[PDB]
Symmetry: C2
Subunit: 238 residues, 2 copies
Amino acid sequence: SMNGIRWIASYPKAGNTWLRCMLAAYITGKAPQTWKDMETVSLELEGMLHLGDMPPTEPTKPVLVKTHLKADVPVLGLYSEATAKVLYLVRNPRDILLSAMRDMESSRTFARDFIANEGLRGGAGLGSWPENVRIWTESSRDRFPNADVLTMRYEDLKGDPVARFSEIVEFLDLGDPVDIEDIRRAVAACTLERMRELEKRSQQSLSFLGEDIESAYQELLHGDSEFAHYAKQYGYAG
Amino acid sequence: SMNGIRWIASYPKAGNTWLRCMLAAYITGKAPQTWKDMETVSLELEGMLHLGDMPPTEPTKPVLVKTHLKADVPVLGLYSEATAKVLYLVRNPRDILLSAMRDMESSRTFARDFIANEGLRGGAGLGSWPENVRIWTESSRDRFPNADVLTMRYEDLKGDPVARFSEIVEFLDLGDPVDIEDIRRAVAACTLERMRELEKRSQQSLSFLGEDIESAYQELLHGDSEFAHYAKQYGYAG
């Protein structure tokens, strides 16, 4: 559709933020200097809800909302009809794990938790990694019957940002035709250093944790679990 | 009404929890041992929303929900028709301030913040103290046109728990007639020590901060501010 909700959905640390920076820069025309800047272009569902706020259930315009919640949580139900687009980002779960921790004893325990849970524990509306990936990539067209769905790997976005981001922008159908030079500008606006300034201005293998831990991950990764199923599917496992 | 939402609303630390313990014990028949126990009897709106969950917009039974959000936040709007009762607890703002901090430099700054904000900063859907008190005690019958409203001081509940809590239980209209002996049991189930075990098992004047700070509070308290208006109204000021 043209009017309606665009979900930028993903498991935490799956590239969501970086994308929100690029979307902010592409649309506003200027590179975000703080997080507030990004809020101009896209909302955080969890943030809104934290304040008893929520996105428009009947939107007169395109609306970009980020969330990490599973698509089946009761709140998302409210937007069954109003949702026009679903963008889902996937990232290598290992990279999510490492990312989340950022004191060996402290980390290992965390790492252990992650492996035992196949993800993060917010909590239950977040689901495990495979849970979140499955629901969004497979059940979205059910939960949002007016929506087009697009799934992308963080890694792929990262390897060809101009190509992939233009695809994303095009998919989102924001009303104007995509201009590639804007795309490049937007990619450049959210460089690693830039993302670093954002953090600042707003304030491998698992071997180091121990081979015992790498081992445990590898078992999960190649085992018979749902986690192992979706990892393999997105080229994160053998 | 009989079916529908019962809000247990208040500013944070205004007695809400203690009441939820008594309600849990009155209803289940046993003293809560953890917080999960209380969730049996009453829900936390913020908690649910945190998980993308939410209370029933069309409830087939009486439903007790706690919240600290202002009654006018967009999310509460969803329950305009379904709300049957509003219980609002008020507490002495000074006691809320002290309560919230629980390292002089650390506290003073906090205290200062509080005074400058007339309350807490979650954030904006929480509103300042006077904001929260005003909206709930005055605008409730507007926002929930099928609801009866009852406001009570934490202090009064504390001074005559059996009398006040029976009033509360009666007001809530949970379906069964109030039995006083149950009331006493429920009060006894949530003694100070008991409340202490709950914390554990689940894991004055502002002079000490400095006379400069007490002074600042006193100015707020007797000044011309909304804060000062509602304080005076509930007997917390001169």
